[PDB]
Design a protein around this ligand. Structure first.
Ligand SMILES: O=C(O)c1ccc([N+](=O)[O-])cc1
Length: 340
């Protein structure tokens, strides 16, 4: 509770609110960019590496098909995503550089993070050592302290959404489920292995779901697999709600203790959601070696620098069928996306 942290977060919230209340809109257009490669694809959108034709800068352009967003009931989520991203500012949050829309699609032009997904690195090495997991975890703790102070819940923590930058630090990406919430919210969203019990059980839930997800992430980083793994979602959900977790014997006692407090089924007893808030996590013995300010200032040497050749190198991302970016002659779903 150092006044220094209080004053930092008060300024952070002031700056967020000014942008939140007057969002930027329509700051580029599609023909300002060349398409390079598809980096990922989903049921209503895609991410493509693009290059700005005048500056030469590379970006990750997320393209969402308006009709599919509507069909999959993602309108509000998409509006949340863009309004939040244009208003936030933190060292471990990916930057939204431009946004715009056309007759068919919504576009969010993000910084490109060439090291690829944490998930790929984790799966290639098997598991991270505790110091390595702790370095990433510390960045997530600080990022959640920031987001939660702004009344934002992230709701999609998982290794695929954490990209590794040129200095070996995290960039949190994919704000598709992020939401500004005072009090409780109810939507079923997230990824199965990372869902808190109160989401599975259809309760009104709060920021404590992000702290649960951090427990899942730390476990998965340190073990190589998530704590509630099973072959089918229903089996995963049964394990999540059960109140039981098994730890590998290689985990330190401090790690097990922290994880029991993050993976606490009773949200009213979960670290990050008690009277001392984030400080119960920051002051835990597992984080005793963490210099929180040095992490924030990016002065700690990272566990590894991803291997890549330059800002246009796509070698840490995988290969997808290349599909057209078609723009209809007629405006689709204009009313739904007026504010974008
Ligand atoms: O926020 C996102 O969804 C996002 C996805 C991918 C990348 N990227 O590939 O750098 C950046 C942001």
């Amino acid at each position: 509770e150092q006044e220094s942290v209080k004053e930092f977060l008060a300024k952070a919230k002031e700056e967020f609110l000014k942008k939140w209340e007057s969002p930027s809109q329509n700051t580029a257009q599609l023909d300002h960019f060349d398409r390079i490669k598809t980096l990922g694809t989903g049921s209503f959108g895609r991410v493509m590496l693009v290059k700005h034709k005048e500056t030469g800068n590379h970006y990750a352009m997320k393209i969402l098909d308006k009709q599919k967003v509507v069909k999959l009931k993602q309108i509000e989520h998409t509006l949340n995503e863009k309004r939040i991203l244009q208003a936030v500012n933190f060292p471990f949050l990916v930057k939204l550089e431009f946004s715009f829309k056309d007759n068919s699609n919504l576009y969010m032009v993000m910084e490109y993070v060439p090291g690829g997904e944490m998930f790929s690195h984790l799966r290639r090495i098997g598991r991270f050592s505790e110091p390595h997991a702790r370095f990433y975890a510390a960045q997530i703790v600080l990022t959640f302290e920031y987001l939660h102070s702004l009344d934002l819940i992230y709701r999609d923590l998982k290794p695929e959404n954490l990209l590794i930058d040129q200095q070996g630090y995290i960039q949190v990406t994919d704000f598709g489920f992020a939401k500004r919430v005072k009090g409780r919210t109810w939507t079923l969203c997230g990824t199965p292995e990372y869902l808190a019990p109160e989401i599975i059980l259809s309760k009104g839930y709060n920021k404590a779901v992000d702290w649960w997800a951090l427990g899942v992430l730390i476990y998965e980083m340190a073990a190589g697999y998530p704590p509630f793994f099973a072959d089918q979602p229903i089996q995963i959900y049964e394990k999540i709600v059960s109140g039981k977790v098994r730890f590998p014997s290689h985990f330190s006692s401090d790690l097990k203790d922290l994880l029991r407090n993050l993976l606490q089924v009773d949200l009213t007893k979960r670290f990050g959601n008690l009277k001392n808030g984030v400080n119960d996590i920051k002051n835990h013995k597992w984080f005793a070696t963490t210099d929180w300010i040095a992490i924030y200032q990016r002065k700690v040497e990272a566990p590894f620098i991803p291997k890549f050749k330059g800002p246009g190198d796509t070698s840490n991302f995988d290969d997808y069928e290349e599909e057209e970016i078609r723009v209809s002659i007629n405006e689709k779903c204009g009313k739904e996306f007026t504010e974008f």
